[PDB]
Amino acid sequence: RTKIVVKVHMPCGKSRAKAMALAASVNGVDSVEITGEDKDRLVVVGRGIDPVRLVALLREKCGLAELLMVELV
Amino acid sequence: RTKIVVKVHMPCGKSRAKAMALAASVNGVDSVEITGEDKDRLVVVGRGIDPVRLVALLREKCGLAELLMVELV
């Protein structure tokens, strides 16, 4: 089990939904959540997730994204 | 804040990802999670989510779905 936290440019509900649905569509994801005071942290938990590829998809579709944490759960 | 639990026909990783991404795409959703021993419970948390419409979208795209719980968080 792996937990990944990505800071994402997502300044409205529509853009939060686009990013959440992108992360949720990666095979092996069990959980996706938006957190933080600014609602700009995407938290993804699953098995067999490549963090580098996930951040690259989010950067491509949301414009800006940065990997903040990877952690075994 | 509202938490919704839907039992969904999702017997593989690909079909779990399709259902998760469908729930995540609804505006106002903050969290989506797959739970249960059989990995067949979709847990959705957010604001302003219509549970009846959510279950109807999941039924249409995954084949079978049933609302199990709605709860204020």
CB distance B20 to A25 below 8 Å: yes
For chain A, which domains are there? 1-73 (3.30.70.100)
Tell me the sheet residues that pair with A44: A4, A32
Edge-first strand listing for the sheet containing A65-72: A65-72, A2-8, A41-46, A29-35, B29-35, B41-46, B2-8, B65-72
CB distance B34 to B6 below 8 Å: no
Largest CA distance in chain B: 30
Q: What's this structure's resolution in Å?
A: 1.8
CB distance B65 to B16 below 8 Å: no
Per the entry, the structure determination technique was: X-ray
Residues of chain A positioned with their CB less than 8 A from the CB of B33:
30-33
**Distance from the first to the final alpha carbon of chain A:** 5
Beta-carbon separation of A32 and B31 below 8 A = yes
Query: Which of B33, B61, B73 is the mutation pick for testing A, counting most A CBs within 10 A?
Result: B33
Helix and strand counts by DSSP (H, E) for chain B: 2, 4
